[PDB]
Symmetry: D2
Subunit: 386 residues, 4 copies
Amino acid sequence: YQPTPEDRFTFGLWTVGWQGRDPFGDATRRALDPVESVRRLAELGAHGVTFHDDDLIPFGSSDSEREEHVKRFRQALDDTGMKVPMATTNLFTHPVFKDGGFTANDRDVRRYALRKTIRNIDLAVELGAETYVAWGGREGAESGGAKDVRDALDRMKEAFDLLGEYVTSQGYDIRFAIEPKPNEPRGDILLPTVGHALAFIERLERPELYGVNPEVGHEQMAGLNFPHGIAQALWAGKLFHIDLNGQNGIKYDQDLRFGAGDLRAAFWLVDLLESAGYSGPRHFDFKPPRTEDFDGVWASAAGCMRNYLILKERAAAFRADPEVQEALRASRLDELARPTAADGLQALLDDRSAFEEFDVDAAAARGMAFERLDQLAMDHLLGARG
Amino acid sequence: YQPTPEDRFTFGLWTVGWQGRDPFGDATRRALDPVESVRRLAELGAHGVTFHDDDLIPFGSSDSEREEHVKRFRQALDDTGMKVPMATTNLFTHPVFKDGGFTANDRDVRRYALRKTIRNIDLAVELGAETYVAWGGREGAESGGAKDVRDALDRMKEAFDLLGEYVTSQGYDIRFAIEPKPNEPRGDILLPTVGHALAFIERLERPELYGVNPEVGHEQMAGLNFPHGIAQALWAGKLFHIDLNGQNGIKYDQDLRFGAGDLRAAFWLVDLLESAGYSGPRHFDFKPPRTEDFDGVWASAAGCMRNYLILKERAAAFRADPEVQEALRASRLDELARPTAADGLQALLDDRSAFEEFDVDAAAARGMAFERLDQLAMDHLLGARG
Amino acid sequence: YQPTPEDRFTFGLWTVGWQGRDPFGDATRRALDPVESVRRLAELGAHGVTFHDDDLIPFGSSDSEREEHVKRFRQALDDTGMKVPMATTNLFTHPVFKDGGFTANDRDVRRYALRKTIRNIDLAVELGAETYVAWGGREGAESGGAKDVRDALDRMKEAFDLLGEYVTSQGYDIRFAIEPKPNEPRGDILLPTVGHALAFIERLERPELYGVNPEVGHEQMAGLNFPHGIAQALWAGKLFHIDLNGQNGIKYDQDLRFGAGDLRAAFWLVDLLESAGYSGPRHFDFKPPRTEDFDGVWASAAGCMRNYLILKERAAAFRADPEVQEALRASRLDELARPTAADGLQALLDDRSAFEEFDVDAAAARGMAFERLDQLAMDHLLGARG
Amino acid sequence: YQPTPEDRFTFGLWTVGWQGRDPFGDATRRALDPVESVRRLAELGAHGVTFHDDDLIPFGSSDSEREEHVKRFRQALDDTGMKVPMATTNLFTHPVFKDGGFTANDRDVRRYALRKTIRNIDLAVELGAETYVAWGGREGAESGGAKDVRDALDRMKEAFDLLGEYVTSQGYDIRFAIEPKPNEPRGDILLPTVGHALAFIERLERPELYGVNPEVGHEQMAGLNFPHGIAQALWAGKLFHIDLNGQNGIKYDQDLRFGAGDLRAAFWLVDLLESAGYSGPRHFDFKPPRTEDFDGVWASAAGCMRNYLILKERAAAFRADPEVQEALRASRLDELARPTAADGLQALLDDRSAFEEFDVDAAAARGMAFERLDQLAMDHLLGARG
Ligand SMILES: [Mg+2]
Ligand SMILES: [Mg+2]
Ligand SMILES: [Mg+2]
Ligand SMILES: [Mg+2]
Ligand SMILES: [Mn+2]
Ligand SMILES: [Mn+2]
Ligand SMILES: [Mn+2]
Ligand SMILES: [Mn+2]
């Protein structure tokens, strides 16, 4: 289960670089130099890195300091062959963003937020990024009166429409991906799930430029089925990117390494991504627990890729097993793929065998054989059969 | 706080008619005759009633029995002035629907499901229904392999597209509303939240015919902010109908009476619906607890309308208070309504006061005064000020 | 992974006998004759069966009908060698119990509840039961005023104290186990978790007679860590019995087959039960999904035992691996077992190396090597190493 | 609704002093000088203040700096009349505590943890503290193998037993209160709810010295009913202290101001505390949202006390209303207070009216009239009746 750059595993600078500051505790690890993360990630077999603007260029840097940070970063990429497939903006850490970026009540912060984003889009494109992610972590509210959500959605649409106008006027070959999250650090965050984000995209001026970057743990923070939500994003043609990690249920955003948390959901997710032919980055938005030294940071990053490769192998065996193929037919998964009424509304309406002569009681008695199917998947996940 | 038919309160037959059968218990109340619910609801001041097909016509009835049930129902409506503003299909109770209706793996059940729906649409329209609700309570899965969700969404789109073709070919003046629910009775239900439903509607052949019927407790079963989700449905022009009730957090679907559960969320919801001018039915999808006799059933139904009328009065006082108007300006809610960059992308890009000369530290120091605002809302909800 | 009676797997009659009636649906399966469940469970390798009174003797039966049901049941046990290690009372299904059994507000129902329990204790003992379980599924409330919880706890203590007085006066060799559940079918249930039940037991007149029967899915319905709670029950000497099944997070009580739901939690649970030497029944309180025919019912029951046997093997390999032993020492699990201050309070107070000369910064820098440990456990669970 | 020191409202230094550092953001407020919090809290009508050691004495201070901080603090108390009713230790912020204090795997950290606690107990007593709180926020684990929970409970019992030996050998008149929390900042925290803490206390060497300090939002983070859990702590004689705040359901620990979050639960809580005669501090463990300036900090602190005083008035009106007294009798709350079988086990066993001549069907038909009762409570909370 050795990872190679062909597996397209990527990592954010903020992930292995997380110092371990949490709400009740100080940092337990020293800051990594972005250049040293590039090199150690390359050694582990990573395909690329991603970044917030403020991960690479310290907030408040002059153009002269900004340029020097980009230079040393670029040389590290050239020496390693490291790709930069995705970039994003930090619109949440600085106190100025305490009520949001794009949907802050203060108009001047919103304008500032857009200028800060536009500047990092330039850098992202120059560096090779295909996807630009937006996580609106501060867009939201703790109390009901603080935020008129219709106006806030107007302001959110205004911001993304202006970003779309910017990139098309520049001729940049980049798309946007909204990363939803239901809560934390705001009591409720706008566009809280994959679904709300997908619906919002349809009201943008150029919807074709926008998709989602769903994260395993965020959907699970709402008790949702992450594979199902990924299937809906794929069905809509909107899975531009994906954040992989682990989460144990409805609580604070844990960002555990991928495979931890809900193990069966991770299996069904890999099964879907591979059998659907998803070809984008397998990105890990995770946090090595602050109990770990730097040896643990790299072991946790390596475990991310290792668990994906193991689940990939197990899912492929599950689908390739002829006992499983026969179980799928016994559950009538193949009939799910058949149009319900390709004969048309009229034909269906004049089909007495569909309602008048329908033997409802004989149909009710068929078993779906779902448990036998599910035990075969369990056996394959656990390796009790190949 | 007396309810009148002008308040547009409606109730499902299955609500006050709930006998109290729960997963671990037998019915504690006798079945109500639909005609007797119409009359007692009329006496309480209800505006109308809604129904599943199987609430009015016992499953398996002949056309002769079907017709006689509709007759006595219609006379009750004529005698009372009761409206029937919404109707829906029961595609979940009968064992034949154990793997779904529109997305059952068995093709013949899916065809049956559509014929059963189409037949009740005719009745709904003849009876005056403006909205036809679809709750896909059985569309979903307990295990990951049981359901290919991309195919299931194809089958779901096929079903609603055929319903849209039916009603437009008949010239019916009726729209559809999808009622989302995240889980129960399936482990995970398809289209689990308002957002997923809104996104799905955009891929239908005639999206203008379809909106959502959100329910207070269902969104709350995913830990979501119901007012926020209602604001997004209103923003999209898709709030066709609404289910009001109460729910205490993330657990089984309680269907408590409206006002119970999350009381502040009910206040912010009423505030939004009234200040937005929502003009559809205020429908209560609730269940009188099975501890109650028939006196408790009607007291619980009356409490639904009473709590709405009380919250309406308190929300109107909150908005009409000049101290609250001044608190709203102190929090810059009025600036949220101002376009971020109506001067355009070019102007914004050449505005040095938006990024180059932006005093980020002075902006960071502004307080949003959200707590004072929220205490004023609390005071108004509790009646510690008028 | 073949189960034998030595593995002590047991099943309730109500589990494989679940007809599939859920809150929104009718039964999808015919009722099993208790004698036929005994025989098919024996064929699968089950060690024994458990029952509610009302599973074996239909509610309202005369003594003559009661006796005949017990007779045919007993012959089935004698023919198979089937044990009856645990029994319990149904104090939740009948409408008379709609506000509770032991803590119903009506005094006459409480007296009735105790007489019904006492009668089944006699039968349980005559049949060989070592453990008598109490699940107070109706003890609780939907609304805050319905139940004075201090008085209800007085009534709960009164009931169990009287049961303890009964069994000791009869000389029965049986203990009680409280099965906690946080909610469903009541909005909130009294003694909602393992912890509350353990604390309550300490205020009974004879605490030594009472322990807990925790269920995987119930603790998980509160977002709790089930292995941790089992460790606390073992630490207190109170794990009398255990209910094994599966649950996907905070939602309705799913009662999936064991291994489904949270797979890693099931691994850590088996690891604990085996390395602690738990010798009681491995009981499955689960529900074959109502999508299944009778073939699926038995496949689901067999999967319960199969997943336990697979996790047992994987946990034993994890603990037996010398790489894991060395990882445990690297994380200082062995030092956790060392008394903190066996030298005493005085010695500790005069130890300058514990506070005055303590190098807090050097201690802060140690990594706990938890991720490497956890990846070894993952590898063992998945079978990527033996 | 003006608060006076007679109302016994207290606040932690860390509450109004919270600078607004959250997991994704930097501080938005300057640090308050402990002396300035004492004075402004006194002006608002607070009864007293509480503190962690590290709130008053910066970590790593010499005895000379430690003494000077205590001096200026004490003068502020003397000038104001401010009480210090409770104190606690910070065993979670410093990186040395990243795997726990009392249950850290490293034995030397555990010894350090006890010495740090013992030193602040001296100060607490000298300052007048009646209650010493322990929040074991770092005692726990992210992964299953990191922590043997039986050993960790041994180490937890060892620590509290040594604290009990210390305070009794010194003759201090102080008791301990464990503050439970289910998760955050560890994935799972030991003693996660009021119940687990109550059960653990019973295994300490001197249980009479230990009770609980429950927090509104922590129990609610597990979906539990906080009033019910408070009733169980009162029933056991263990409510030594209480943390009041607000929380919106199962998510990160919000620490909103009291009254926010679940408003009806706050009403039922106040109703219980007042009708039970709880006489301890009404302590607010809350966090002014980081959107606020210092005006908002004090408005949020004032709102804490204001909402308590408003709910107190409404609960007293509810109980004093003769319509509510009559509703309580209609629901048979008075019969809940009657012993079930004060006539004894023998009498109960020979009472044919309790089982043989029990009219189960007539009893099943009684309604509990819970909804009418609950609407009266709603009306009182909202002020739709006095
Ligand atoms: Mg992410
Ligand atoms: Mg509904
Ligand atoms: Mg059970
Ligand atoms: Mg606290
Ligand atoms: Mn995350
Ligand atoms: Mn509902
Ligand atoms: Mn269960
Ligand atoms: Mn808290």
